[PDB]
């Protein structure tokens, strides 16, 4: 019951800085790399009293891969896993895919094969990237093509980071987001999305962090990925493996875009002045104020909702909680999936990061939802791309890499064909 991870781009490796911080903390694994069957999913034993992740960090720019090599997590990570490039993709989908992409995939794809044969219970994959720069967009679509044709049958958990609706770190990333989604549609088995201003807004309102940096964001993002894989790492009343997400949330093979959320997002001082049970955290995860993307669920419908709980949670009260969700009319499921609910329970609760921002709670929920609410984000992301594409803005960089007018049109009609499915299933 293993699952190997890869981390592409600045956003991916920055997630790995905090995501593996809480994985090794949950299993008592110090940064030195030592202190039974729980840690085998993400940590392999090396001889006697030592552990190594099944992790790969790739970034064509050498800026932050070496930062881990000189940071505090030097002994934990095997130094050959920390793969680095020579020059930067520089916010170009084509540069990370054809020029600089094609010089290092021969190293990392065959290295990912090495971890496969080292493992036996490889369930699937979980990649970490963003649609902002060329690394997270170009190199992943290149690698996903060669990883899909290599294995195919195995699953892939895509934890992408959108560009926000109005907030944004760059100008050219609509070209990156529309081009990487043209290839990611037919390859990724599950596409989990994250937004920038939403997670800024969540910790400001609920957690009361008025001035967060990116390291504060990646703590709870790793908690979200840690929650879905906690059922594999620990025992519970009703465990769910990675294969449940493909069978429960993907009604059609093209609409495979869930939405992640987490609760209770509560600070240290508010935990004492607020009681936590399954009912209020369940209703808290469905409201738009706590969704990880800037899309309101009332505009659309929930096709499916996988509720993954942690900590001491009995199995009879969850049935009462989901009953209140079904009768509440502000959120409504589709008639084609009336029993749109899956429950998962784990006895081991979440762990608090030392020096972090989140507070320790006896129970927590990590709810995944496949819905039509993401079609609004696709439309406004596709709409803003049309103004730059109409004037041929920033096209001379991509076609200078080797592309042409053609694949931009294929990326446009593919997005319309994707939205053609969302308006179809929204009936």
């Amino acid at each position: 019951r293993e699952c190997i991870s890869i981390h592409v781009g600045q956003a991916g490796v920055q997630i790995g800085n905090a995501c593996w911080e809480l994985y090794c903390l949950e299993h008592g694994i110090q940064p030195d790399g030592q202190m039974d069957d729980s840690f085998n999913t993400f940590f392999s034993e090396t001889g006697a009293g030592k552990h190594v992740p099944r992790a790969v960090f790739v970034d064509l720019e050498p800026t932050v891969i070496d930062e881990v090599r000189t940071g505090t997590y030097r002994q934990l990570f095997h130094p050959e896993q920390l793969i680095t490039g020579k020059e930067d993709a520089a916010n170009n989908y084509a540069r990370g895919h054809y020029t600089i992409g094609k010089e290092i995939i021969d190293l990392v794809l065959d290295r990912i094969r090495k971890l496969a044969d080292q493992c036996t219970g490889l369930q699937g994959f979980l990649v970490f990237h963003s649609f902002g720069g060329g690394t997270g967009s170009g190199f992943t679509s290149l690698l996903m093509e060669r990883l899909s044709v290599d294995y195919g049958k195995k699953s892939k958990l895509e934890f992408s980071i959108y560009p926000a609706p109005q907030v944004s770190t760059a100008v050219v990333e609509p070209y990156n987001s529309i081009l990487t989604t043209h290839t990611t549609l037919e390859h990724s088995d599950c596409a989990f999305m994250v937004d920038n201003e939403a997670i800024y807004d969540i910790c400001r309102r609920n957690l009361d962090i008025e001035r967060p940096t990116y390291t504060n964001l990646n703590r709870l993002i790793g908690q979200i990925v840690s929650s879905i894989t906690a059922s594999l790492r620990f025992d519970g009343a009703l465990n769910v493996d990675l294969t449940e997400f493909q069978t429960n949330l993907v009604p059609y093979p093209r609409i495979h875009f869930p939405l992640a959320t987490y609760a209770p997002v509560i600070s240290a001082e508010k935990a004492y002045h607020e009681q936590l049970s399954v009912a209020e955290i369940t209703n808290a995860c469905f409201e738009p104020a706590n969704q990880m993307v800037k899309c309101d669920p009332r505009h659309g419908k929930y096709m499916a909702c996988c509720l993954l709980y942690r900590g001491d949670v009995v199995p009879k009260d969850v049935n009462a909680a989901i009953a209140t969700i079904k009768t509440k009319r502000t959120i409504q499921f589709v008639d084609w999936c009336p029993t749109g609910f899956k429950v998962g329970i784990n006895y081991q609760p979440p762990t608090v990061v030392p020096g972090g921002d989140l507070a320790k709670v006896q129970r927590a929920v990590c709810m995944l939802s496949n819905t039509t609410a993401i079609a609004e984000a696709w439309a406004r992301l596709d709409h803003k791309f049309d103004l730059m594409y109409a004037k041929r803005a920033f096209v001379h960089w991509y076609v200078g890499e080797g592309m042409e007018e053609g694949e931009f049109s294929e990326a446009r009609e593919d997005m319309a064909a994707l939205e053609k499915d969302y308006e179809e299933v929204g009936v």
């Binding site: 219970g121 025992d235 069978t247 429960n248 059609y252 009879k316 009336p338 609910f341």
Partner: protein
């Protein structure tokens, strides 16, 4: 001597099966180590019907514990009674079913069921004369629903005369723990009605309802539900495990509870089910047990019996008791409540009484019932099936394992035919 080979499949079937061995081992006074320490020699009389004699006065159950997730066996092995089972019976794969009926029936369990069938042959040929196969599985998920019906097909193929006993835990929409419930349920019952001769339709919604109303439990875990389902399994086999004034074999229950071969879907019950507070404020007399047995709310299925009629019911009693008071209560429950009993059958009741009550309790009873009201469980599952099947949601995950759309059509026709025939005799 009417031996019974036990099968456990799926997480729920392993959980109710694990607690089931906990209860009857205490009835026979069997240590967790397997050594016999019972007070009465009658416990060791028919101990062979679920155990095998071993050296050092040790015993081992004939429990074939099947699954596709190895974590379920570790919980059973680490449990209070994991050490009594044979380590060879634990046949289990590596990857779970993922809540897919077609995986356990064609790809995942199809390679594993061939290894399991050799163990069924091992325990059967060691028997003197086996009576039937007591199987425990849930229709929710892929393991119990898909691989379980496949295993039932092979055993029914090789043993076309033995009693195929199953305990199908089937949930309702009130507790929808999995989105793929109707496909797992509709496809599983397509095989059960053609092959099996007993189907104890147990529902989780009814099981939680027992804990609040009559048991009055604040935090009913699954283990509390497993204790109730184990009481029904120990009740039906109590006749062929101890001496009794009327010993009804499972075949002698199947002959009375099955007026037509397809009408073999039952609805169990158990009494006395008293809370901790209501222990001293309740009489142990026989009429008090009977009113709790035929109580419409004390059924372990979502379908209320008042919405239909009983074709035929059975009441397996335990402990010392007069037969006359039992016959009057079996008589009175059909005179005044004749609307809830079909009159084209003259006598719809079966009686049985053992001379050994449960451990700790003075008297007890166990109910079986084949009601026309049970069809609404199949009706609501068909509504959920047709709701998702009208647009073909989540069917493509079944096509990968070679399963075709016509098999869903054949299951739905056999499902809907089962609803019509209970409506006939209502």
């Amino acid at each position: 001597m009417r031996e019974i080979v036990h099968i456990q499949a799926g997480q729920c079937g392993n959980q109710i099966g694990a607690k089931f061995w906990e209860v009857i081992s205490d009835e026979h006074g069997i240590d967790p180590t397997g050594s016999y320490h019972g007070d009465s020699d009658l416990q060791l009389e028919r101990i062979n019907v679920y155990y095998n004699e071993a050296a050092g006065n040790k015993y081992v159950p004939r429990a074939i514990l099947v699954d596709l997730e190895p974590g379920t066996m570790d919980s059973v092995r680490s449990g209070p009674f994991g050490q009594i089972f044979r380590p060879d019976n634990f046949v289990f794969g590596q990857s779970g079913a993922g809540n897919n009926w077609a995986k356990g029936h064609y790809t995942e369990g199809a390679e594993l069921v061939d290894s399991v069938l050799d163990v069924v042959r091992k325990e059967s040929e060691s028997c003197d004369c086996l009576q039937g196969f007591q199987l425990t599985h849930s229709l929710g998920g892929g393991t119990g629903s898909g691989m379980g019906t496949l295993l039932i097909s092979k055993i029914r193929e090789e043993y076309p005369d033995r009693i195929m006993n199953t305990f199908s835990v089937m949930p309702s929409p009130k507790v929808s723990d999995t989105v793929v419930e109707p496909y797992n349920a509709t496809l599983s019952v397509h095989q059960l009605v053609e092959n099996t001769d007993e189907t104890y339709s147990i529902d989780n919604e009814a099981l939680y309802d027992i804990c609040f109303r009559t048991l009055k439990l604040t935090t009913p875990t699954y283990g509390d539900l497993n204790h109730l389902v184990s009481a029904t399994m120990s009740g039906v086999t109590t006749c062929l495990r101890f001496p009794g004034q009327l010993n009804a074999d499972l075949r002698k229950l199947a002959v009375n509870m099955v007026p037509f071969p397809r009408l073999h879907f039952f609805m169990p019950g158990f009494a006395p089910l008293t809370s901790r507070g209501s222990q001293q404020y309740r009489a142990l007399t026989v009429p008090e047990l009977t009113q709790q047995m035929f109580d419409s709310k004390n059924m372990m299925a979502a379908c209320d019996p008042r919405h239909g009629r009983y074709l035929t019911v059975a009441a397996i009693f335990r402990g010392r008791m007069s037969m006359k008071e039992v016959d009057e209560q079996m008589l009175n429950v059909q005179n005044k409540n004749s609307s809830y009993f079909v009159e084209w059958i003259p006598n719809n009741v079966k009686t049985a009484v053992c001379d050994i009550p449960p451990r700790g309790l003075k008297m007890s009873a166990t109910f079986i019932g084949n009601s026309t009201a049970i069809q609404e469980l199949f009706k609501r599952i068909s509504e959920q099936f047709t709701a998702m099947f009208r647009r073909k949601a989540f069917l493509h995950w079944y096509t990968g394992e070679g399963m075709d759309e016509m098999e869903f059509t054949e299951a739905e026709s056999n499902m809907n035919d089962l609803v019509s025939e209970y409506q006939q005799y209502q």
